[PDB]
RNA sequence: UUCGAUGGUAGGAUAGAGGCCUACCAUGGUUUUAACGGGUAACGGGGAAUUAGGGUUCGAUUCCGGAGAGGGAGCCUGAGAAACGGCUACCACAUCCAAGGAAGGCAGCAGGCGCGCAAAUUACCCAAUCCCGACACGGGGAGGUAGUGACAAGAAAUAACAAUGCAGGGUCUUGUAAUUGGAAUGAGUACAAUGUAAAUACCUUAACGAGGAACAAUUGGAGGGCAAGUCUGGUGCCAGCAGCCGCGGUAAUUCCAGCUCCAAUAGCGUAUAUUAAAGUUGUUGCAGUUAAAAAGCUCGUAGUUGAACU
C-alpha cells in the first residue's frame, strides 16, 4: 500500500552450470542429507557467503576500531547462538572458514536423524513433514529449521496420532473393518 | 600517449566521448536503428501474412533447399523473409495464414548457410508451431 | 534455386518413414525416490566400472 | 496456543454504547438492519437529485400533461 | 537586439522584487571551459540490475517535486484554479432533432472498440489508514477485501517399514522385484470452532478418504564447447540438423523412429533489450615498425603540464 514489502531471492546460481568437481560434491551432499533438490544447498551457500562478505570486511580495519569492535561481536553471538560456531573457541578468524557440511548438519533434520527414530535421513524427513514431529514447545513442520543450542532436548513423539496411540484407526480401522 | 595530468578530466572524458562512436556496440545502440530503419521497433515478435515461398540455396560448403517463406509485417509494411524450422510445414503453410515472425538469435545476423535471412516463424493460424506436428492441434477452417 | 523451389519434395522421408508403437513400461518413480535411484546405481551397486569408463547407458 | 484481545466495559451500558455495529450484532442485542443494495441507493440518490422539491408535484404534472 | 536582446531613470501592472509592460537614454549579454541550433523511441530524483575495485545500463510505475485532463485561449466564484466529474469561443470528433434546437471530454474506479508479441471483475464494504462536512450518528471506486491467471519472492505432494532368492559384500547390509501384505498415509470429502463489515483463505475439527490407471512429471540435450550412445531400424549432400566449428554422396555416435542416460525441477526452452566476461572504450587499465592506427614538416593562441630555494 503506502510502501512495497521487500522480497529478495535467497538461492543462486553457479556461474558454470556442469563441473564435475562441483556437481560430484553437491549430489554427495544431497545424497548424504536427503535434501529435497540443490536449491538448499544455493541458499545455505548464499547465506554463507553473506556472512562471510560482513566478516572480510569487518577484518579489512584496524583493531580497536569501535566499528569493527562493535560489528565483530554480534557475528560471533549470533552464530554461537544458533551453534554454527561451537560452544567456545571463537577468535572472529572462524567465521570465515565456516563449510556447508556444518551449515546443513545444523539443520533440524539432521538433529533428528542423529536421535533416531527413523533409520534414514529421508524418513526422518518424512516425520518432520507428518507434523509427527515434537521439536521444542512449538511443533516445526519444516526441514531447515536452523536449531539453537536450547531446543535439542525436547523432541519426541506426539501425544496424538497411531504412534504416539489414541485410537490410530484410520488403516487400522479399514484393516479391522476387513 | 594518453593525458594524465590532474586537471585533464574535460580532455579525457571527450576524447572517450568521441572515441565510444567507433564502438560496434555503442553505434547500434545510439544510432536508434532498431527504431529508424531496422524491421523490428525492438519487438521480439510481430505478426505478419505469407506472401510466397523461396527456395533458397545453402552456400558452401553444405547444399541443400531452405524452405524459406516470404511475409509482408502488418504493422509496419515492409517485407521480410523468413525461415521455416521444421520439415513438411510448407505444405501446411498456405498464403494468409497470419503467421508469427521472430528473431533467430543472431542479434539480427544471418544463421548458419541460409543467406539473407533473419526471421524465423514460430506461429501459423495462431496456433503455434511444434503443436499442429504431433496432431495436437488442427488449423482453422479459414 | 535461384528463381525456383522446392515445395513438392519436402518432408520425403518423414512421410515415407515406417511408424511403430511406443514400448509399454509401468510406473517410475520421480522426485527424492528418483534421486535416491540414481545415488544407489552410482557407486554402491557399482555394476560399469574398471578403466574409469562410469558407463550408464552401454551400447549393445 | 491460541490469543485474542478482551474488552471488558465493567458496565453494560458502556458495552452498548462504545462497540462497533458489527460487535453488537455478533452479540446479538437489537435485530440486524435489512436495506436495499448499494447501488439502488446510490441511484435512487441520483434520482432524488434529479428532481426537486417533495417529489410529488412531478407526477401530479405528468398526469396533468398527459390525460 | 524587428515586435526587449543587455543596463540606467520615471511610471504602469502584480500580493510582492523584477524590461513583467510602457516612454526616454546608452550597446550592450553569452560563447572552443562548446554559446546557439538540432535530436532524444528524455518527466526528474530517492532508487534498481551486474558487482574485487573503477565503472556500464535502467528508473512510466507503491515515496517527493513538475505538467496535463482532446489542442489552444479567456474568465467568474473562492484565501487558495487560469480548475475542466467550473463556464465560455474556435479547431477534430459523437449523439437525440419534430430539422426550431439541444447537448460532452473515463491520461478516475469497472466494462467495450481499435492498435497490438504484449497486460484483470460493468464484484463487496466504509470494518481497519485517513479525508471532507453544520458533525458520536453522513459520505468517500481514496482505501480494505475478494474473482482471474504460470511465474514476482518464500515453504514443499508424486512416497515408504519387511519376508524373498540371486549379484554380492564381508555373520551386518545395497540393488533387478510381472510377489505379497499389514502399517504412516495427504490431496480431496464432509462437517464444527476460529477468522472476517460479510465472507474467501490461513490456522484449526472429530470423522470418510490408495494395494497399482493407486490419486502415470515434465522440459531440453546425449561430437567439442558442456554432462550423457559408433546402439537397432528408414532416407542417402535429398529430406534435413545445426548458437560456432560442423554431420549427411548405402555402415549416419550430429537427419527421423525405438531403448537408455545426462542437467533443472512444478518447472524448462525459445526471441529480444541490457550487464559481467570486454584489459574489444582501457583514469584505474588497451593498442599505433610489420595485425587497424604518428598529421610530410614547422610556427603558433586557447587547453594541459610546469626546475630548485623561504
Redesign the interface.
Known sequence: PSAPRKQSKTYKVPRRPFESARLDAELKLAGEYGLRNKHEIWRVALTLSKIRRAARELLTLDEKDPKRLFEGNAIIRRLVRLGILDESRMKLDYVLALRIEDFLERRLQTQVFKLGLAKSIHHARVLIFQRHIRVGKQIVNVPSFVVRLDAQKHIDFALSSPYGGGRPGRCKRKRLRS | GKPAGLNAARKLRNHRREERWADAHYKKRLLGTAYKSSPFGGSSHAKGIVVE?????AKQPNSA?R?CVRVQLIKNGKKVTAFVPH?????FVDENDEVLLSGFGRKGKAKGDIPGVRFKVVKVAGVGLSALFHEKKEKPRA | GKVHGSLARAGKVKSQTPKVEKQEKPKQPKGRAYKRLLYVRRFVNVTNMVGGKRRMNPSS | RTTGFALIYDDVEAMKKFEPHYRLVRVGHAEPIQKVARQQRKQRKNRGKKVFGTGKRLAKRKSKQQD
Open positions: 515461398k523461396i527456395g533458397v540455396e533447399i524452405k520439415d513438411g510445414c510448407l505444405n
